[PDB]
Symmetry: D2
Subunit: 191 residues, 4 copies
Amino acid sequence: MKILVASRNPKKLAELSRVLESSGVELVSLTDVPEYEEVPETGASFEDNALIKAREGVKHTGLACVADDSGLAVDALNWMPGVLSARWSGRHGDDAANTALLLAQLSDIPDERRGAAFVSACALVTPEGEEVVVEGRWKGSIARIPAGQNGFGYDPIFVPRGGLRTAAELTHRGRALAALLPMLRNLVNLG
Amino acid sequence: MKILVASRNPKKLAELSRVLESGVELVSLTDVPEYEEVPETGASFEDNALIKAREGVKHTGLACVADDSGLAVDALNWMPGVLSARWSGRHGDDAANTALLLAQLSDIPDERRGAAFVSACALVTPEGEEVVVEGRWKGSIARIPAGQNGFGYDPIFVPRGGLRTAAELTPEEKDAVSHRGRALAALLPM
Amino acid sequence: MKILVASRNPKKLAELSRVLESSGVSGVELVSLTDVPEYEEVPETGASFEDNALIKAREGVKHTGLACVADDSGLAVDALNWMPGVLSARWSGRHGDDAANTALLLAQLSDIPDERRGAAFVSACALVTPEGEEVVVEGRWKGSIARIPAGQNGFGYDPIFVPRGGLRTAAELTPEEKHRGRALAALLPMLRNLVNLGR
Amino acid sequence: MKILVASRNPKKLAELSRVLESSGVSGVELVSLTDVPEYEEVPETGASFEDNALIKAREGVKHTGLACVADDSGLAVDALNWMPGVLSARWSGRHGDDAANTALLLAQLSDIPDERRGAAFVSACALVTPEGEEVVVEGRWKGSIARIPAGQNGFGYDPIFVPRGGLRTAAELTPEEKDAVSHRGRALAALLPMLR
């Protein structure tokens, strides 16, 4: 079966192809079908926005469509930057400017109120109109100064819960996560 | 390695073991000293799964998975939420919970009857790392119950993409919905 | 000038008249929903008294061309994600059985510890002008839900609503309460003036 | 009886004092923060002007034992999940830089179609009594965010706030017009049935 991946980034398809083995699915990207207008995204709901993108994919191709939506949710900003994460400073794709704005907005906020999460949502919409959306949230808080060089986006200022290091400072924990992650997808049982 | 499943339901632990088919021993709450389970409020299945998983770690030092599931109805500001099982005031009275929901929505037109079945799962590590995932099956609330192959709100939940209720779906129809839900859960870039 | 009040209760229009006389406004006759042709009233859902008051006022303007004031009141309970909300009066599923609404709420919350029993009585008022201006105001009286009803001088959820600042329910307050009056009588107008939208 | 106005702005007491004369409330003395010992003001987060006004009023009572009125106002934009919220005056990271706050908002909202640019000016006010009774009110003036600034008869976000019912921004409104919007807001606040 052909499934439309509502992305032009082959990195999404490559990971999705290898993850679908864990059975006859052929994945196609937006670069394989005629271009269509992409509705701009607003608000804090990664889930709603992943569903909107996935609905549009089905609408234009008649194929089942998976779409994703990811970003940063900050309690003190009412869970924004939200789906404006990549353009929070007003400038799309400028990671340093997005981070600089966030730090300045939060510059007086004590650590106890700097809670935040990295969020990633994935939606599936079928030709028959079934809708399912999933999301994952990695809990943490916003640092006061950026640290670390092994990360993109907000990694230099996102401190995962459970430590003091930022995500960009990250290189026993692997074996614990690698075995625990499957159970998180298993206890999900919508039917 | 021991992983605590924050549940006293032995069928849940057995099913979770069947998904592990790696040197991992799953332990339940009944295998560890009893502790008081704080009652749940609000609409956030994610927050409540995390609370239960944190509590498991706090009492055992083990990594802990917890789940939290129910029905979220747009017209009730995403309640019944974590009160889904006791919405009528009486825990486990599925028929009364359903009858209450219908009565609360009795004059609401189809366009505003949107709802979702939600299932959230949380992981907390001994070191305090926290991850929560949730799945949402989008649909709407029927006006009358239909079907006999379901529990809870299944007789009045109409999945988007059809007119039949969840309780009217065959077992084959129900597995195809849970296979795609778990397939999305594995795709999450995070 | 005529203003539509989106109500069938003459007492509501009487109070608005008394506020326009104590506000120093003249030449304003209020008309009710029985003074204009009947129109379909869309049922209310959700937790937002403000949004729902605005929906009702827009509809009033739509059918009459008059400025329209509408109101929307009820109970917001933290543990119910701020429901009963605009379903407060029919929380048990049937409008007008206050006793059943109150019993359902208590039963729904029966295991919730005091610290998480927070709630508020909310009252929202919206104005939409013929030109399409929209203003909405709300007031919230903070409190919590009792575990058992008490008091006999109240309707609706009053026997199970505990105002913050005491242990008594709204139904337990004496008419002389409504020393506390003089503090409220001076403070209430100050909340009204400081709502300064036009800046 | 003394009532604390949780403000250091003398204009706030005068406006409230004039309202105690129009009510006819006797024997009430208004006090400002400049008349009581200084205490730490906790920074504000989120979108709830109501919650933040209550936090400020509670703090006043805690430090003085007086009934306390406090206010909190700003801009709520649908597309930013009702932010800038209580960060309205420092939305760009710099308090009081209206040009920077407004330009950032415009930049954040570029390419957002008119139907989704909804917004509101919000003004909330809280009362907390010595006994711990809590009442909070808010008013919302509905509108949307312009694409380019216009008008000079306003500060802050006035040049890019388009009130519902017209195409002009708040900064393009005359003083006669801006007077009538606070009059209707305060008249609605007095009409609120629960205020009974």
